[model samples]
Target chain A: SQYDFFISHASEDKDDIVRDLAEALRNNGFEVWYDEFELKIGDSLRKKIDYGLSNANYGIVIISPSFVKKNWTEYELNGMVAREMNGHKVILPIWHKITKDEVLRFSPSLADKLALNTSIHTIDDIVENLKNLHHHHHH
Target chain B: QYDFFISHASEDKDDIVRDLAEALRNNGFEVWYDEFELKIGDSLRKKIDYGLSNANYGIVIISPSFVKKNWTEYELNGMVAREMNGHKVILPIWHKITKDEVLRFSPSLADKLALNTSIHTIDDIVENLKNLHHHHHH
Candidate 1:
């Protein structure tokens, strides 16, 4: 089955942030693939992430203070770039209380593609945006 | 032969690991760092197995992509099996804030081993690895 969404974010917010989003998506029965939920043995960073890019219908990137400073977060963005170039509507940049300059300096591709402040600032707002976008996806 | 193997995802964390590699090299620990091992179009799984098997201790990097990475998992499992035999030390160091989740996800490493969480960034990892290097006798 085509994955509902592939969410990418920095590891710093994983426990307090990303995990909740994954659970909520699952609760709503969306087929979300977060690394926290899907990592298995015998795979390289590029391999599984490339598979997720090829399979997932959409991509969600959470940009924040920590995301800018992490190399792993940049790795996640590279995966998004590949997925985007495939003629898929694959890039959705969501800011998490960080300024536009932060993303431009750190995640340049996302900065170029998305308008500033595109995502709702709060967790509930972001979750609501996801649900709304996902509902639009069904009909 | 010294004692530590530093397995890392090259593209994401090379500069940071490079510094750590140099420090360990200076400290006289025989270190097998993977930025040197992974080349263009190389078979990652094979080299990872070779490194994990030959080294006495493994310094696993836990990052966002590292968790999802197949090569990292392969190296990790090899270390796990070796650790089960009491033949290797798998000392995981979080390259970032990927500390708790990695432990929770891979209970094999978490249940028996401890991670060096004193470092949270690339620079932090370097200092922490240096300390580990000093603590271990070559």
Candidate 2:
């Protein structure tokens, strides 16, 4: 895969948290498909998003209230899940300010999937986990 | 005819929607809430259609209970269809959900500008709505 992760998130989270997370992932030598870095003025939103969804090895879906209601974010997440349904584990969900009940309400199958919770874990902890996954498969 | 038509699942009546409707009303927005607006003899379909069409905006609370209901779906689709015809009709509120769940339901609606209860308070949402009204008037 050209990109290590396709970062799926609501635009609302961009300045608050997602930007820093994307930076951390990139600094740790992971190629990330973040819209801020990838998309330019006049770029086709659909084409770029579709490319990122198909090209990335994994999708990091930030599960926040904002993310759930966002169309583009949902589209990216669906693309990742579609990849998983095709027999590849391509989605890594990170729960932010959401309950298990809420997650289940969103997707019963996804609720059963393992996810990183921001309430209990720090960004560094998540990055370490991502690094491990990167090196585990790469080496 | 009204400032907003709040479309929500009946499950949220006692909690979120009630509070939200109250807040919006307090903020001076003429809200069309089913509880107050719907009478016993009124046609359900007609009232809903009127609410969806006549209001300046439609607020759909996208919650767990919301996705499962056929009625909310109908209301949402109506608002979205209005949006397709070049009217900014829908204002979605992400109550409790994930991207996986929403996309499974409707990808198109997800793309619109929305307010999330997680990040915004009821008062904050009201302020945003007020600002939207101000912007619309200008």
Candidate 3:
């Protein structure tokens, strides 16, 4: 896979949260896929997202109110969830200004999976955790 | 790997989950149920992820509680995703739900072939599962 992780987040969080995290993960030697880097002008957004979902080894979802509300984020999440059901650990969730209970309202299955919370862990800590998870997934 | 991951609403734990799990266990099919498997300090999310990932099939008990409950919706979503991914089957058991209700909540599930409690008894369902498992293994 070209990308170690496909970053799934709402557009609202892009400038503030998703871009910085993607940059951090890239700095850590992980091939991260963010829309800014992958999607070109006039690109078919759905096809590109589908390609990312199919090719990436894992999906890192930033769960927020906007993410939960947006259809595209949910679509990516469902694809990742399907990958997990297919016997691969593909989703690594990061809660950004969201509660587990709030996630439960949207997706109980996703809420039940372990995730990093921004309120508790710093971005660097979360990146380290992701690296460890990636290591474990491979070996 | 388990033969089935028994996904149900907490409200139906005593009335349906316990009996159904017991019957499946008695029939020699490995089952994953939270009450029997999850322990103190075990991460609910991790354990659920493990169960959903490893289970060969998912048995979802559909009821009013299931339709409205959040956790059950999550479990169902996991199972449906499995089916969509072309890896496993979601054997839905309609407990106290109607077709219209199912269609409203999830058209994908409503379109799937399901076993209804009104038509088939618990024992009959278990027997069918046993046969299916044996066929799959062979």
Candidate 4:
């Protein structure tokens, strides 16, 4: 089955919370492809991210300190923008522990897109939004 | 003028009825199940409407005796018609054995649509329904 969403993050920021988020998504029966699971033992980083970007239905940019500083993160965001221009849906600039202003200035693509407030909201809220998209688009 | 809206038939399902109502009251869910929960001089229809309108969600305990009852159909449809207006309501729980053979045994409920098996357990049902409710209200 096609992945519902692909999570792109800086390798430096994958912590307990991030791992929990991935597990929660999977527990709710959503197909979440991340680098930890998507990458092969000997695959190149660029190739894996490219493969994920090509096949994913949506992209979630996990904005962190390393993400803003890393050249690869910028490349991923640029690639996502270029892919979006090709008529693909890519979600950018989702802040985890970072400030909203950082996300706004960093990507600017998510200026009007819906962002998840994981700090204040429960996992159920996120899942509900994802599931309802199917029903909402159907009508 | 039953206090609670008993959706079950005249069949021998009253024992489980009392149990369900007591359980609901114990759990702080002011319920509307008539056969088990109604008190003296209680207006069943009004209670049904109140519970239907104000409660967090509805518990439709579907059973063979329940479907056989004509009033149950009226109440069920009444809820369906009222709650169709962009709201998430009604949690239908199969209290007894429910399968394709049982639900499709009747032409009315089966003829128009195929009923899927609701998730198992009351908590599971509530989780699915409320998640749906959140999506709808959002």
Give the Cα lDDT of each candidate: 0.55, 0.64, 0.64, 0.48
lDDT of 1 by residue, A1-139 (tens): 6777787666676775677767777787778877742332333436545666677766666656676555445555565555553444555656554434445656666655542132223344555667776677654
- Write one digit per residue (lDDT tens) for candidate 2, span B67-107: 54434455456555565234566677877554434555655
- Second chain TM-score for model 4: 0.49
Q: Which pairs clash in the backbone of model 2?
A: A71-B110, A71-B111
Every model: Cα RMSD to truth? 14.1, 16.1, 17.4, 16.5
Off by over 4 Å in 4: A36-49, A71-82, A85-88, A104-114, A134-139, B1-138
Quote the true-contact fraction of every model: 0.00, 0.04, 0.00, 0.00
| Per-model TM values vs. the true structure | 0.39, 0.46, 0.41, 0.37
Give TM-scores of chain A for all candidates: 0.63, 0.71, 0.73, 0.62
- lDDT assessment of candidate 3: 0.64
Candidates sorted by lDDT, descending order?
3, 2, 1, 4
For model 3, how does the per-residue alpha-carbon lDDT over B1-138 read when each residue is reduced to its tens digit?
667877666766786677778899998878866642333344434544565678777677766566653334454565555542344566777765545456556545655567765445577788888877776764
The complex in candidate 2 yields a DockQ of 0.04
What are the iRMS values of all candidates?
10.7, 7.2, 18.8, 19.4
User: Higher-lDDT candidate among 2 and 4?
Assistant: 2
lDDT of 4 by residue, A35-77 (tens): 6433222434455556775676666656554454443344545
Tens digits of per-residue lDDT for model 1 on B23-90? 66776667768543444455645654566567656666554445544344445665555542344456
Runs of candidate 1 with Cα error greater than 4 angstroms are A1-139, B26-32, B35-45, B52-56, B70-78, B81-87, B97-138
lDDT of 4 by residue, B38-89 (tens): 3334443555566655454555555555554434445445544445345645
DockQ of each: 0.02, 0.04, 0.01, 0.01
Highest DockQ model number: 2
